Amino acid sequence: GAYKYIQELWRKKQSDVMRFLLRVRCWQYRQLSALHRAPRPTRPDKARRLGYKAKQGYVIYRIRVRRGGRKRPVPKGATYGKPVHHGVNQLKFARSLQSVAEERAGRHCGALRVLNSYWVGEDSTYKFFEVILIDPFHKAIRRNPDTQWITKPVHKHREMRGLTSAGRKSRGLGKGHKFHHTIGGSRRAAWRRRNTLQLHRYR
């Protein structure tokens, strides 16, 4: 199959062939708007892995996210507190730029449902992501038992609740000794159990 040749080619990004392609596209993408529909997956291969099939109701939006950290939105750097919270410049955002991309796609396309997303290029000022979106109301998706899980109201706005692969990476969930702080559903659920007095009726 061709897809393994396309896979291992995309792993050689410093190669003359892919450096040219990643530069001529990362040029092309800058001259478009920050949130526009791609007519197909730029990487058909990667989209296959992430669950995109080539059938009606699968949509792909190329959305660019402005690049860098997160400086504190405080008038003239005046955080009126203790020197711990004086931080304004070198601060970082808890979610990746890819997760911020998935949710700019998912918010604008309020009707569609964000499946997953993949990198397609980075300038110094802009990262570019394709976001895989699905119509829960197209009969191709709505009559497929494989994909009628996104057609259920539990999976509205997965991007806004860190339920897409990119949003899950921000949450610090996972099994084992490194991920104790998110035992239970989440970081908040962990905190809740630990910071509750169980006052048993008898005790």
Binding site: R143, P145, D146, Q148, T151
Partner: protein
Amino acid sequence: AKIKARDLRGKKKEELLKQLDDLKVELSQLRVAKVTGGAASKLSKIRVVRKSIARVLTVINQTQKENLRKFYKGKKYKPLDLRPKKTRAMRRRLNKHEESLKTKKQQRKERLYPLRKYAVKA
């Protein structure tokens, strides 16, 4: 004449609109009787006429919408008025057919490995 909604339903379309105006004029004449200042016997009748207008207008509207949802019965596209209004989220659910759909791979599991009725000795 005591107007009931049993000896309205069988009657004809323009036969009921005749009776509607026969009540409308009757009501407009009672509202003149209310202002010309007399007849407590007529000021009681004003409510009786108001309700009998409502009875006729209901049966007019009942028979329209019994006829429209007979017209739109066989069709694939019926107006938003005639479609089942329940909750919004309940209309958005998968159909009685779509929830019932299984993959070929899962129908094969159901056939090969059905959950058996068993019972173990102690």
